[PDB]
Structures are given as C-alpha cells and as structure tokens.
Design a protein around this ligand. Structure first.
Ligand SMILES: COc1ccc(C(=O)NCC(N)=O)cc1
Length: 164
C-alpha cells in the first residue's frame, strides 16, 4: 500500500532558470527514488518558471530530502515545501488542565526543533484553558504535524492546526 501521492511530493521554489528535469532529478535522487520530477516552464518560450516538483516513492524519502536542506541545486539555494501557508507555529487544543510543558515537548520534539511552548492560562484566574501553542525553528515540522490524522498527547486526542 503506497502512501497517497500528494504526501510524497515536494514543491521546489527558487530554482535556477538553468535547472532542467534532468538536473533536478540528479540532485534529488540522492535522497530517494523519484517517480516524477518536473521543472515548470512557460508554454510558449520554454523559459523556466523558476519552480518545479519532485515525487518520491515514500514519505520517508520526502523526510530525508527535507532533513538534507539547505539544497543548493545548480548553484542556487532552493526552497522545498511539502504539498502553502508557511508557518512555524501550531495551535494544540483539547489538552485539558492536566497537560504540562514536558508532555508537549516530549511529543512534538520528534517533529522538529522547538523554540517556544506556550500553555494558555486564563487571564483572570490563571487556570489552564486546555490549549497551547508550539513554535518550531522551521516550517516543515508544522507541515508534517498538520497532515497527520491524529495526535495523542498525555492521553488526549488533540486538535492541531497551523497558527498565524
Ligand atoms: C529538526 O527537524 C526534525 C526533528 C526531528 C525529526 C525526526 O525525529 N524525524 C526523523 C526523520 N528521519 O524525519 C525530523 C526533523
């Protein structure tokens, strides 16, 4: 059973206009099997639109490629992103009053490097409100997080979405 193809694609922005299907493929095949690899071009001039996409055989290969950033392709640092609202912060809801910072850290640190954990408390009483924000050092952590169907933190089934 193959993962859905949409989850195996990387949009690559900021390409050199000299990058071709072939040179983009030669670069990104270092991190996995590519089932597709295309540079977007103008239909009339064939001049590069400066972006393209690659599709890996598995999600683990996408992960490998993203963990190998920054990618310098044909002399230019490019901008890969998963199949964009490009943010580094998530909202985590449904954590109730018993969820602590270490619960969130221990779970989310395996998605990316955490810079801020903010457990929300009531302005008047100081009681926990049952949600939190986590800020990572990079957007791919968030992109991996929000495409999961489920997140279980401290026994709670949480709602997780991109924040601001
Ligand atoms: C700092 O960014 C991170 C931080 C952690 C991970 C992680 O645990 N996953 C392993 C993997 N091969 O993808 C991946 C990326």
């Amino acid at each position: 059973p193959k993962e859905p193809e949409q989850l195996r694609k990387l949009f690559i922005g900021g390409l050199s206009f000299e990058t071709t299907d072939e040179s983009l493929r030669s670069h990104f095949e270092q991190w996995g099997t590519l089932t597709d690899c295309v540079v977007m071009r103008d239909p009339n001039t064939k001049r590069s639109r400066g972006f393209g996409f690659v599709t890996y055989a598995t999600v683990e290969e996408v992960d490998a490629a993203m963990n190998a950033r920054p990618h310098k392709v044909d002399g230019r640092v490019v901008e890969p992103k998963r199949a964009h609202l490009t943010v580094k912060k998530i909202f985590v809801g449904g954590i109730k009053e018993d969820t602590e910072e270490h619960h969130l850290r221990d779970y989310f640190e395996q998605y990316g490097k955490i810079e801020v954990i903010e457990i929300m408390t009531d302005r008047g009483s100081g009681k926990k409100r049952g949600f939190a924000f986590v800020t990572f050092d990079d957007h791919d952590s968030v992109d991996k997080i929000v495409i999961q169907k489920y997140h279980t933190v401290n026994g709670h089934n949480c709602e997780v979405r991109k924040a601001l």
